Scaffold this active site. Structure first.
Site, PDB file in Angstrom:
ATOM      1  N   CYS A 137       0.854  -1.194   0.000  1.00 54.48           N
ATOM      2  CA  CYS A 137       0.000   0.000   0.000  1.00 54.48           C
ATOM      3  C   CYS A 137       0.889   1.243   0.000  1.00 54.48           C
ATOM      4  O   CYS A 137       1.715   1.415   0.903  1.00 54.48           O
ATOM      5  CB  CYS A 137      -0.954   0.021   1.201  1.00 54.48           C
ATOM      6  SG  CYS A 137      -2.167   1.441   1.223  1.00 54.48           S
ATOM      7  N   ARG A 191      -0.267   4.606   2.842  1.00 57.86           N
ATOM      8  CA  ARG A 191      -0.237   4.372   4.284  1.00 57.86           C
ATOM      9  C   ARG A 191       0.111   5.603   5.125  1.00 57.86           C
ATOM     10  O   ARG A 191       0.090   5.494   6.356  1.00 57.86           O
ATOM     11  CB  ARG A 191       0.739   3.259   4.609  1.00 57.86           C
ATOM     12  CG  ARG A 191       0.199   1.884   4.248  1.00 57.86           C
ATOM     13  CD  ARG A 191       1.177   0.840   4.637  1.00 57.86           C
ATOM     14  NE  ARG A 191       2.238   0.736   3.642  1.00 57.86           N
ATOM     15  CZ  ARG A 191       3.363   0.057   3.803  1.00 57.86           C
ATOM     16  NH1 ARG A 191       3.647  -0.549   4.949  1.00 57.86           N
ATOM     17  NH2 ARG A 191       4.198  -0.063   2.770  1.00 57.86           N
ATOM     18  N   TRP A 223      -9.291   5.831  -1.223  1.00 58.54           N
ATOM     19  CA  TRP A 223      -9.575   6.518  -2.470  1.00 58.54           C
ATOM     20  C   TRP A 223      -8.489   6.140  -3.470  1.00 58.54           C
ATOM     21  O   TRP A 223      -7.447   5.593  -3.108  1.00 58.54           O
ATOM     22  CB  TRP A 223      -9.684   8.040  -2.282  1.00 58.54           C
ATOM     23  CG  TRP A 223      -8.475   8.677  -1.672  1.00 58.54           C
ATOM     24  CD1 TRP A 223      -7.297   8.976  -2.304  1.00 58.54           C
ATOM     25  CD2 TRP A 223      -8.327   9.124  -0.318  1.00 58.54           C
ATOM     26  NE1 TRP A 223      -6.428   9.577  -1.427  1.00 58.54           N
ATOM     27  CE2 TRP A 223      -7.022   9.665  -0.198  1.00 58.54           C
ATOM     28  CE3 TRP A 223      -9.166   9.103   0.812  1.00 58.54           C
ATOM     29  CZ2 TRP A 223      -6.533  10.195   0.995  1.00 58.54           C
ATOM     30  CZ3 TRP A 223      -8.687   9.633   2.007  1.00 58.54           C
ATOM     31  CH2 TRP A 223      -7.376  10.170   2.089  1.00 58.54           C
ATOM     32  N   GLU A 249      -3.986   3.629 -10.894  1.00 60.44           N
ATOM     33  CA  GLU A 249      -4.744   2.370 -10.857  1.00 60.44           C
ATOM     34  C   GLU A 249      -5.799   2.349 -11.957  1.00 60.44           C
ATOM     35  O   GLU A 249      -5.965   1.350 -12.663  1.00 60.44           O
ATOM     36  CB  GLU A 249      -5.413   2.141  -9.490  1.00 60.44           C
ATOM     37  CG  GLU A 249      -4.496   2.258  -8.286  1.00 60.44           C
ATOM     38  CD  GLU A 249      -5.256   2.187  -6.964  1.00 60.44           C
ATOM     39  OE1 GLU A 249      -5.590   1.050  -6.530  1.00 60.44           O
ATOM     40  OE2 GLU A 249      -5.552   3.260  -6.382  1.00 60.44           O
TER      41      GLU A 249
HETATM   42  C1  HEM Z   1      -6.773   6.399   1.484  1.00 59.00           C
HETATM   43  C2  HEM Z   1      -6.085   6.241   0.350  1.00 59.00           C
HETATM   44  C3  HEM Z   1      -5.419   4.928  -0.162  1.00 59.00           C
HETATM   45  C4  HEM Z   1      -4.619   4.897  -1.242  1.00 59.00           C
HETATM   46  C5  HEM Z   1      -4.227   6.121  -2.095  1.00 59.00           C
HETATM   47  C6  HEM Z   1      -4.176   3.531  -1.453  1.00 59.00           C
HETATM   48  C7  HEM Z   1      -3.327   3.066  -2.439  1.00 59.00           C
HETATM   49  C8  HEM Z   1      -3.029   1.740  -2.715  1.00 59.00           C
HETATM   50  C9  HEM Z   1      -2.509   1.208  -3.962  1.00 59.00           C
HETATM   51  C10 HEM Z   1      -2.165   2.035  -5.215  1.00 59.00           C
HETATM   52  C11 HEM Z   1      -2.369  -0.113  -3.837  1.00 59.00           C
HETATM   53  C12 HEM Z   1      -1.844  -1.079  -4.926  1.00 59.00           C
HETATM   54  C13 HEM Z   1      -3.070  -1.752  -5.542  1.00 59.00           C
HETATM   55  C14 HEM Z   1      -2.795  -2.480  -6.839  1.00 59.00           C
HETATM   56  O1  HEM Z   1      -2.012  -1.994  -7.706  1.00 59.00           O
HETATM   57  O2  HEM Z   1      -3.411  -3.560  -7.036  1.00 59.00           O
HETATM   58  C15 HEM Z   1      -2.802  -0.475  -2.499  1.00 59.00           C
HETATM   59  C16 HEM Z   1      -2.806  -1.734  -1.954  1.00 59.00           C
HETATM   60  C17 HEM Z   1      -3.293  -2.082  -0.704  1.00 59.00           C
HETATM   61  N1  HEM Z   1      -3.915  -1.259   0.206  1.00 59.00           N
HETATM   62 FE1  HEM Z   1      -4.027   0.823   0.067  1.00 59.00          FE
HETATM   63  N2  HEM Z   1      -4.728   2.759  -0.458  1.00 59.00           N
HETATM   64  C18 HEM Z   1      -5.522   3.557   0.346  1.00 59.00           C
HETATM   65  C19 HEM Z   1      -6.252   3.087   1.432  1.00 59.00           C
HETATM   66  C20 HEM Z   1      -6.167   1.854   2.041  1.00 59.00           C
HETATM   67  C21 HEM Z   1      -6.901   1.419   3.230  1.00 59.00           C
HETATM   68  C22 HEM Z   1      -7.917   2.328   3.952  1.00 59.00           C
HETATM   69  C23 HEM Z   1      -6.538   0.142   3.516  1.00 59.00           C
HETATM   70  C24 HEM Z   1      -6.969  -0.815   4.666  1.00 59.00           C
HETATM   71  C25 HEM Z   1      -7.666  -0.433   5.749  1.00 59.00           C
HETATM   72  C26 HEM Z   1      -5.548  -0.261   2.523  1.00 59.00           C
HETATM   73  C27 HEM Z   1      -4.911  -1.490   2.447  1.00 59.00           C
HETATM   74  C28 HEM Z   1      -4.240  -1.983   1.327  1.00 59.00           C
HETATM   75  C29 HEM Z   1      -3.788  -3.343   1.102  1.00 59.00           C
HETATM   76  C30 HEM Z   1      -3.941  -4.488   2.114  1.00 59.00           C
HETATM   77  C31 HEM Z   1      -3.225  -3.394  -0.109  1.00 59.00           C
HETATM   78  C32 HEM Z   1      -2.577  -4.614  -0.794  1.00 59.00           C
HETATM   79  C33 HEM Z   1      -3.670  -5.322  -1.583  1.00 59.00           C
HETATM   80  C34 HEM Z   1      -3.049  -6.529  -2.228  1.00 59.00           C
HETATM   81  O3  HEM Z   1      -1.993  -6.973  -1.697  1.00 59.00           O
HETATM   82  O4  HEM Z   1      -3.582  -7.061  -3.248  1.00 59.00           O
HETATM   83  N3  HEM Z   1      -5.362   0.800   1.652  1.00 59.00           N
HETATM   84  N4  HEM Z   1      -3.194   0.683  -1.853  1.00 59.00           N
HETATM   85  C1  LIG Z   2      -5.628  -1.493  -9.851  1.00 61.83           C
HETATM   86  N1  LIG Z   2      -5.730  -1.569  -8.380  1.00 61.83           N
HETATM   87  C2  LIG Z   2      -6.705  -2.610  -7.947  1.00 61.83           C
HETATM   88  C3  LIG Z   2      -6.548  -2.727  -6.444  1.00 61.83           C
HETATM   89  C4  LIG Z   2      -6.131  -3.918  -5.874  1.00 61.83           C
HETATM   90  C5  LIG Z   2      -5.954  -3.983  -4.502  1.00 61.83           C
HETATM   91  F1  LIG Z   2      -5.528  -5.146  -3.983  1.00 61.83           F
HETATM   92  C6  LIG Z   2      -6.208  -2.876  -3.693  1.00 61.83           C
HETATM   93  F2  LIG Z   2      -6.028  -3.000  -2.358  1.00 61.83           F
HETATM   94  C7  LIG Z   2      -6.630  -1.674  -4.264  1.00 61.83           C
HETATM   95  C8  LIG Z   2      -6.920  -0.422  -3.485  1.00 61.83           C
HETATM   96  C9  LIG Z   2      -7.538  -0.461  -2.234  1.00 61.83           C
HETATM   97  C10 LIG Z   2      -7.794   0.733  -1.549  1.00 61.83           C
HETATM   98  C11 LIG Z   2      -8.467   0.717  -0.192  1.00 61.83           C
HETATM   99  C12 LIG Z   2      -7.419   1.944  -2.111  1.00 61.83           C
HETATM  100  C13 LIG Z   2      -6.797   1.955  -3.368  1.00 61.83           C
HETATM  101  N2  LIG Z   2      -6.435   3.145  -3.938  1.00 61.83           N
HETATM  102  N3  LIG Z   2      -6.566   0.785  -4.026  1.00 61.83           N
HETATM  103  C14 LIG Z   2      -6.798  -1.622  -5.638  1.00 61.83           C
END
Ligand code: HEM
Ligand SMILES: CNCc1cc(F)c(F)c(-c2cc(C)cc(N)n2)c1
Ligand code: HEM
Ligand SMILES: CNCc1cc(F)c(F)c(-c2cc(C)cc(N)n2)c1
Ligand SMILES: C[C@H](O)[C@H](O)[C@H]1CNc2nc(N)[nH]c(=O)c2N1
Ligand SMILES: C[C@H](O)[C@H](O)[C@H]1CNc2nc(N)[nH]c(=O)c2N1
Ligand SMILES: [Cl-]
Ligand SMILES: [Cl-]
Ligand SMILES: [Gd+3]
Ligand SMILES: [Gd+3]
Ligand SMILES: [Gd+3]
Ligand SMILES: [Zn+2]
Lengths: 401, 401
Positions: free
Chosen positions: B105, B108, B277, B282
């Site tokens: 993420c 964070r 958000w 993405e």
């Molecule tokens: C508030 C703005 C947030 C932004 C800008 C953001 C951004 C991102 C991005 C760009 C990814 C990569 C996703 C991908 O390419 O598939 C990601 C992954 C992830 N985010 Fe965040 N996120 C946000 C909020 C959160 C919140 C609120 C949580 C949990 C309470 C969270 C937990 C995670 C997890 C667990 C992943 C990994 C998902 C995976 O391993 O497939 N995120 N995030």
């Molecule tokens: C092409 N991204 C697909 C994708 C895969 C994931 F596993 C994610 F966790 C999120 C994701 C989740 C949250 C809470 C915010 C954010 N901006 N993205 C997005």
């Protein structure tokens, strides 16, 4: 035990069985991954047996007369001398294999087309300079670039190494100021300081070609001015942005790494400069746009009248693409060999499938294969990869100071 | 302790937090598998004991009466039931920690600002639906997005799991075609089929929002249509390419991941959807330009009259930049929160500095943190990182079908 690896663009699955052979252990453990870090007496016989065994299986010659015979001769050479000499064909075979094993090299589709200059009979820096100068002129070839490596004498105990002190054979000067900051390339401030130190008259320029510091065993280094007619350069212009030429940017034709150690069969060559041709993002993205390099990104954006007041205009992204276009256009107009990041990564995918068939896998370093712009627009982004160390290899080595 | 360098600035830090990595990852000293996408009361006790210790550290009460009392309470509860219940404050802290610890993420910096809805009293798939609509309503907030998570009852003995079958709360249908192609989003072909075979009447647009398939313990999944006024969407337009609106492209406001497992102190919550958000790449790069997704890249490039005949024109790089510009302009025009990859990675560098001071390091997956376009134009490219697994944690889990 055999990593399952997936391509997400197509859905295909392969197993990297070659990984089971990996020797010099890398920096990762089950507890933490360090894949993103740049820099992570007679065991010689073990490395020798294995390399000679490699060589003969490659020429469809395992368990044959010339094979067992060559095995005894290395046994005898090490027994008497504590080391051994490679046959010329083995040295050629080892250099190509090390290129083939370089995990961070995206251009290994070319690994079988390499010209090896045997400089193992070298003595003194003056001799290296003519060896180096022949490499440069052969590899440059008036812009029709040709992969080459010059192999200087191997390492023995009690005698100092051959070393090239510059990281590349062609680098630009980096000079400080009445305020710390750097005119020229900041990647080379150290070696610019060392060259000036050893009695070189610096320039006043952003694109001054450094001299060479060549070192022979147990002797100090010597400066050598490169023949200006041997150093082919390309002035950077843009096909449609008339003002880009006025920025005065240039780069050199030949990428020639002169600081890595070649290891074949347990023998170590700290002086073995190799060269190919550039991938255009190396110049237009890393060399010219990195904040700690020439850092030109904002200057190009102002000339393009872009809105640098907010990051969400993607002004950085726009300027970076035009700088890369200018590189490609300029090298093509100069008729100097260059490859764009789409064409190279596409060829690397082709190489991966070759290496699956031939060897059951390919060591590859995802973070270095994926280009520094437009990563997910290239097919290597969606290819899972396995990274590990095989020999023959190119290895990093401490600066000789 | 792994030494870590940032190459833009030259600074160096040591990741001491990595030494505490609990559950193990896919790499060995033989081979690095960092690029792969998917890498007993006594053990429940020791996880629980570790989390409680974490919780009481955070509130500045390590070693207290209440600390030992809670340990004792947890043990007697495991002895007598084989499980235990989280206190509400402990659940809030566990959910924030899981986000904090997520290595992939980039968002964070926000980890401490998270709204936790306690749905552990939820009783059926119908109540589960009501809790989810409320989550979507609160998180969407008319385009001023707020980060939230809803935690449904924990995995426990004697009973099956609550599961949300959808991978996100808002997803567009993917319909396999007559000629074997896909209309809409190819990523969602499997879940689209499941909805239909569970009684959903399909549409046939490219942007049909899917129903929810919600599973109560020891129950078949139940179909639920999302109230249309709860699903905020953004039509895509380009600020200077007026034909761009005629592509009829759209995306939704709320990214709400719903198929991951939240683990806290050995307790497992297979249903705990979370939302934040979007980062513009993405949508603009992966969701729209991936060859196995909407794959609009060549159609935009042609519309832009780029020369799509040679890779060296960089038509792919140029079309992708304008697609990302469109996503940003469109969300800002609609007053829907979005962050571009430059601002996001800059705030992530601040997170790494905050975390280095606070915990001695930060688990980070370089390949996921670096954005899929303009990688080395962002500062996270030039930062070395250590990837490892801390608990509490979000984990992947097998699809329930
Ligand atoms: C508030 C703005 C947030 C932004 C800008 C953001 C951004 C991102 C991005 C760009 C990814 C990569 C996703 C991908 O390419 O598939 C990601 C992954 C992830 N985010 Fe965040 N996120 C946000 C909020 C959160 C919140 C609120 C949580 C949990 C309470 C969270 C937990 C995670 C997890 C667990 C992943 C990994 C998902 C995976 O391993 O497939 N995120 N995030
Ligand atoms: C092409 N991204 C697909 C994708 C895969 C994931 F596993 C994610 F966790 C999120 C994701 C989740 C949250 C809470 C915010 C954010 N901006 N993205 C997005
Ligand atoms: C012929 C065209 C070639 C192309 C397009 C090419 C491309 C590249 C690129 C882009 C890198 C990444 C370097 C960086 O970004 O710092 C690289 C690394 C490397 N290349 Fe190739 N190369 C070529 C030829 C060769 C040859 C002829 C050799 C050896 C004989 C070689 C050996 C290596 C090695 C060992 C590395 C890893 C260096 C390191 O770890 O820092 N390459 N190459
Ligand atoms: C910004 N890159 C600088 C750089 C660093 C390295 F370590 C390299 F190995 C090469 C390199 C070497 C060869 C033979 C061909 C090629 N295209 N690049 C370039
Ligand atoms: C910090 C990061 O590992 C480092 O900047 C690496 C990443 N990938 C790279 N890839 C290439 N080709 N060249 C590089 O210099 C780097 N740098
Ligand atoms: C195969 C490769 O690891 C895969 O495509 C990864 C690379 N990096 C990524 N990074 C992010 N943020 N999201 C992703 O889906 C991926 N995919
Ligand atoms: Cl270079
Ligand atoms: Cl998404
Ligand atoms: Gd003007
Ligand atoms: Gd117009
Ligand atoms: Gd049309
Ligand atoms: Zn690793």
């Amino acid at each position: 035990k055999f990593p399952r690896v997936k391509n997400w663009e197509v859905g295909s699955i392969t197993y990297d069985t070659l990984s089971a052979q990996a020797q010099q252990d890398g920096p990762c453990t089950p507890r933490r991954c360090l894949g993103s870090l740049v820099f992570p007496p007679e065991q010689l016989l073990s490395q020798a047996r294995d390399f000679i065994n490699q060589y003969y299986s490659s020429i469809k010659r395992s368990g044959s007369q010339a094979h067992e015979q060559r095995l005894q001769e290395v046994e005898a050479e090490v027994a008497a001398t504590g080391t051994y000499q490679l046959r010329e064909s083995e040295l050629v075979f080892g250099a190509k294999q090390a290129w083939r094993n370089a995990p961070r090299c995206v251009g290994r589709i070319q690994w079988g087309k390499l010209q090896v200059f045997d400089a193992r009979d070298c003595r003194s820096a003056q001799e290296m300079f003519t060896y180096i100068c022949n490499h440069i002129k052969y590899a440059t070839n008036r812009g029709n670039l040709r992969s080459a490596i010059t192999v200087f004498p191997q390492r023995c105990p009690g005698r100092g190494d051959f070393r090239i002190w510059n990281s590349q054979l062609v680098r630009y000067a980096g000079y400080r100021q009445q305020d710390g900051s750097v005119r020229g390339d900041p990647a080379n401030v150290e070696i610019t300081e060392l060259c000036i130190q050893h009695g070189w008259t610096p320039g006043n320029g952003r694109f001054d070609v450094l001299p060479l510091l060549l070192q022979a065993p147990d002797e100090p280094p010597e400066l050598f001015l490169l023949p200006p007619e041997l150093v082919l350069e390309v002035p950077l212009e843009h096909p449609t942005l008339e003002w880009f030429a006025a920025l005065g940017l240039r780069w050199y034709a030949l990428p020639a790494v002169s600081n890595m150690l070649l290891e074949i069969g347990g023998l170590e060559f700290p002086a073995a400069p190799f060269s190919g041709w550039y991938m255009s993002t190396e110049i237009g993205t890393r060399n010219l746009c990195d904040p700690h390099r020439y850092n030109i990104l904002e200057d190009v954006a102002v000339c393009m009248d872009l809105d640098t007041r907010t990051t969400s205009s993607l002004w950085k992204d726009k300027a970076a693409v035009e700088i890369n276009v200018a590189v490609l256009h300029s090298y093509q107009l100069a008729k100097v060999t260059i490859v764009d990041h789409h064409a190279a990564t596409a060829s690397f995918m082709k190489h991966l499938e070759n290496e699956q068939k031939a060897r059951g896998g390919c060591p590859a370093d995802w973070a270095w294969i994926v280009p520094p712009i437009s990563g997910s627009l290239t097919p290597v982004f969606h290819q899972e990869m396995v990274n590990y160390f095989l020999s023959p290899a190119f290895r990093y080595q401490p600066d000789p100071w």
